[PDB]
């Protein structure tokens, strides 16, 4: 689950992925790949053949950054709103399962 970048070019309607995770800000620091992170949102769904699927976003991926902006500890609304900037290219930094 080492961190990698993913560039999703808005296709048609969506980025073609969904995010689920905590409602609260902050939380415990837990290891992913021996590295400590505050709680992270993750990719709950990927639409097959959608824009995120072609970009190589996988189910379960935990989002460390959105367009280079670290989102450790963020609430679900914060991240979701940040994805919905509406910008035609979205870049995620993700920690795979």
């Amino acid at each position: 689950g080492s961190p990698r970048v993913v560039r999703i070019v808005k296709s048609e309607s969506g980025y073609g992925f969904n995010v689920r995770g905590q409602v609260s800000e902050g939380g415990q620091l837990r290891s992913i790949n021996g590295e400590l992170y505050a709680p992270l949102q993750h990719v709950s769904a990927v639409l097959p053949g959608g824009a995120a699927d072609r970009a190589g976003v996988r189910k379960g991926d935990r989002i460390l950054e959105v367009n280079g902006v670290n989102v450790e500890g963020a609430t679900h609304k914060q991240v979701v709103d940040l994805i919905r900037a509406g910008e035609k290219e979205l870049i995620l930094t993700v920690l795979s399962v």
Binding site: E25, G27, Q28, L29, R30, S31, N33, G34, L36
Partner: protein, 287 residues
Amino acid sequence: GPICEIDVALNDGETRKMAEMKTEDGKVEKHYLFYDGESVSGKVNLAFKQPGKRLEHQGIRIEFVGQIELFNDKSNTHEFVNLVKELALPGELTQSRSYDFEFMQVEKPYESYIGANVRLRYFLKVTIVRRTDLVKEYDLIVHQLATYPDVNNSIKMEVGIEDCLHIEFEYNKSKYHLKDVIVGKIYFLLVRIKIQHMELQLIKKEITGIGPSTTTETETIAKYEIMDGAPSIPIRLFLAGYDPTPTMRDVNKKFSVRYFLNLVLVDEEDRRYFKQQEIILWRKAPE
């Protein structure tokens, strides 16, 4: 046996940081400090008292163990974490030998807790399998870090009879970090009746039960003696002088540790008034 002693030496050695946990006696014990996900690697050194002396053993092992030990008597003990590294197969040793070990990314979910009715421990255990095996334990400490925003929740608790006496205590957050300052004010909204004594106390509740079986041990971390009595007042409680642990909740269902603010008041009638609220403690990363 023929071994003078079993030595465990971490690679991190001088550089790695250490932490102090209170033993049951209250002496300080110093050990190397680890976090979740960190590797545990080093060398196991076995020294013979006399060289050329055959020892026949069934095996040589080192383990990494996270243990929960409940009520001080055995054996509700279970190991939530167990890694094994075999250093040597059944055979023999005729001369001092120095094994390498490496546990690569080690789950350490829970912070070490030494309690009156419960103990959560991490250790390296070297075992030499014989005939009664020889065992050596090397103690490790784990801290649980967290992060929370600097905001003011501005909670309050009140001690109130009704129209004749009313006392309010207001403090800035419900979640404090281990070196934080609790910031408060005690408002005398109403005093139709003289106050003989007032106390603010920070206490810890260790709850060490399984299912219906349940037990609480309570200890008083601090006392704020607001009134010897009797005539608002700013409250600052400095957590850093004390030695609290983070809130630990339902750890493996075996136990919980929680921290409460208590407002205690005694009136002219020697009637006691009591209000209690829970606050959450966390450990802020060093860096």
